């Protein structure tokens, strides 16, 4: 069943990396937008967001 287990695998692991992206903070201070807006005052947080 590789030829289909693979299909579901590609699907899943795709979704997986999709969510996992939100770990990536892209040189912010945080990976939760809530955290970083609560980190700064409005202005610089704007371009940061």
């Amino acid at each position: 069943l590789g030829k289909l287990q693979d299909v579901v695998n590609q699907n899943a692991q795709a979704l997986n990396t999709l969510v996992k992206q939100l770990s990536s903070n892209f040189g912010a201070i945080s990976s939760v937008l809530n955290d970083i807006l609560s980190r700064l005052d409005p202005p610089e947080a704007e371009v940061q967001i």
């Binding site: 005052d41 409005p42 202005p43 610089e44 704007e46």
Partner: protein
Amino acid sequence: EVRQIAPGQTGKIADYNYKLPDDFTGCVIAWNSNNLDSKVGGNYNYLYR
């Protein structure tokens, strides 16, 4: 107390005593007020902080 008066730039004046929007704006200009040497002016003469 005029250095901090700028779009998005903070300062209690800008916090509570004087408005400052951080979007489109014309600009902040200033020059000294040598014309003011009355140290008391027989009055209170200003409201700030």
